[PDB]
């Protein structure tokens, strides 16, 4: 109510709007316009957002952690409440270490929905206070992925519409 | 700053699944409206009045939620209410496909409206308003899936 | 002890697809009942009596199979017939979510009831009572899909 | 070969390209830009295409057969190899009556895929010489349907982008 | 007829999900074999001998259930064991396409082997060895997932 | 007027299902190229040379089909070959989501290329290269699913 600190610290649920801090994990190898759109839309409705970049994915990425983090930072510089960071644990454990209460997930295809539901159940088991929030990609970006853009780019297809200029130039550099 | 979210549905009637969604949503957004469809395609068991009153009581305890009836284009309602976020729960794959389509259409009608999706708790993952009805309409226990005010009103409808 | 299984549906009329499902169940379970819903959601083409009759003839050659009607929750008719098993035909991924819903609810209702899911034969994987009738209603050929008693009945119905 | 008619009329498989005539069945209540895209693409790759309009859909249509047929005729009259007709039969029977050998189906959502496959098995059983061919909608028209356009229009939403002018007028007139 | 069933998988390790599935299979068929794949595609955390041991202990309370290894076509092992039933536990929609494939192919390889699908308990429907392991490769209580012996064994394996 | 279509794939090896698709496609389009991917991400069992050779013999009977290796962007290949139609077979729901994504991308890369989709025959609806290889590898009879030339070459590979 006012000086209620002496009586209670406060619960998360049932009591109105709490501070929100979101993580948006992925490999971002490299960040595409689809990613930027998602994080832009998240940053608009949550207090803070961390773009969390997986340091050691399963498949060796085309860009190293240091390149991924630098490229996303530049592309996201225009969002004042977004911070880019690397991580190397369960998104849940990083989330806890970061005191995040929102996990952002992009929801691109029907194929993924079953996996996303399962991951979310597991994440609720791991970190009950972590709420997963799902955003569909803009129509513009619904078919693109980092994977697809790299493979089109390797064979010289035009991918300028899908990447920020800083990433597109880095990408060309990687491909000779 | 300010977030104002609409959670639309038919809520005929509101279940524990809905309450879970709206509770979670109302922890993340400054205000939430449960927007109850006036004139659903399939004529419902409870009318708007009944639905709105049951929901109002079921969510009375949440400080920052309001229950209202609407009967126009969600774009115009959200705009009327100056809401920037549309909340939908996603139970099943079938429902995602259809919600994705509506999201695209709403992006066209109202570019400044953000659609956002939540998944049910595992506890409520199988319930729906339709299922609770059909079970109770053949005397199955549904007391676990509904608030008392709603259970009673349902029992009352089936007598 | 024993296993007693229920294969519910409207069977309006029964097709070689159903007859396959029940033949396979009847080979792995001591008794099986073909439970023909009396009051389906839409009005049937054949009334329960015609249906129960047609199914009875069609399945005469199966020793441990009984054809009955039922108008209530499956968990009730199961209880009533002292059945421990529920047979569900499982054709498409598009059915699987809905079937998994009903399975959770029937466990909630009747936790001693087991839902068992059989895939139809590739031969019958695209047919249904509905499609068979729609096709027949415009004089398409459906002789491959129905036993003769049913095929004769249907022809007579469409005059 | 030369004049092998005395010897054979020829069979459809194993012997190069044959004349193609497609039917594109639906209720088209009313025809949208999505429909127009499908059939335009069809008409560019097959010799003739018939837009087949279901006389008696299961749900009562907003436009009657006569009105549906007229609206489509107009929307499609710039395609020289397209004809619009009503029909009240199995698509397979109409195609037989019409001596069609291709059935066009639009393929918009995951949810329909298995239904479509099942319909294609039925139609193969009914008319072996009928081939089903599946086209996806343009990104541009991926979300629209007649149903959704009608319900948006009923509530005064702007649907001018999804319909040809003749249809958009007919529609406002129904909903006055 | 007499009913003997095969329940194949890697079971690396077994979980309460499997145990639930095999229990339910067990309770409708005379005998059930938990058929453990010897050489799975990726190398397992537990070797065949450990896996069989963990399983045997876990299911020891089920009289009519026997664990075994197998390193061939499922259809052949089934023919060898004179099994007339194959047990698949259907969790997700995604897997159902792939399981429908295998079932058609097994019908081709072994026409006398009937495929039977059981859906998991709501409780267990998200759990999967691979998940558990990858959780346990970091942290988080899995006591409710695994049986005691498996729990302990896994704990040991960690470091 | 004239139509020229590409059917791209890995065809490692070509099966009866692929032959069915291309036969059907070559009856509706003037010319068809079977385009065989030179460098698949996964290393194939048969190299490009063997894959093209087997495919060439398998489709030798079809007057208006040519089998070619490619190792570039389909858009440039189709452009190189002056092809205006891309043919993909569509077996499963999984395949459809992915195929729809590439079709959008291809429409961005090559607006004048029309993507077209065919369902397998019921006969071949469950087969794939991967599955036939896996059955063969454990001695399963797969003679019904491949041409003689291809069968012989597979048996050779697996010795």
From Swiss-Prot, chains B, C, E, F:
Stored SUPFAM superfamilies: Nucleotidylyl transferase
Pfam family, one: CTP_transf_like
Cofactor(s), by name: Mg(2+)
Top-level enzyme category: transferase
Protein residues bound to ATP: 10-11, 18, 89-91, 99, 124-130
GO-annotated molecular function: ATP binding; pantetheine-phosphate adenylyltransferase activity
Record keyword Isomerase present: no
Annotated InterPro entries: Cyt_trans-like, PPAT, Rossmann-like_a/b/a_fold
GO process terms (BP): coenzyme A biosynthetic process
Enzyme Commission code: 2.7.7.3
Binding partners and assembly: Homohexamer.
Protein name, as recorded: Phosphopantetheine adenylyltransferase
Organism: Enterobacter sp. (strain 638)
């Amino acid at each position: 109510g006012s000086h209620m600190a002496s009586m209670t610290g406060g619960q998360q649920m049932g009591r109105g709007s709490m501070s929100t801090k979101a993580i948006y994990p992925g490999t971002f190898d490299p960040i595409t316009n689809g990613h930027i759109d998602i994080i832009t839309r998240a940053a608009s409705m949550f207090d803070r957002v961390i773009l969390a970049i997986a340091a050691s994915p399963s498949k060796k990425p085309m860009f190293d952690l240091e390149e991924r983090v630098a490229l996303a930072t530049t592309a996201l510089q225009h969002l004042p409440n977004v911070e880019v960071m690397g991580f190397s644990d369960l998104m849940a454990n990083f989330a806890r270490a970061q005191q995040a209460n929102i996990l952002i997930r992009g929801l691109r295809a029907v194929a993924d929905f079953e996996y996303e539901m399962q991951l979310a159940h597991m994440n609720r088991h791991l970190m009950p206070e972590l709420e997963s929030v799902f955003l569909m990609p803009s129509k513009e970006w619904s078919f693109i992925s980092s994977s697809l853009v790299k493979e089109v780019a390797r064979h010289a297809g035009d991918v300028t519409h899908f990447l920020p200029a800083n990433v597109h130039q880095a990408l060309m550099e990687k491909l000779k």
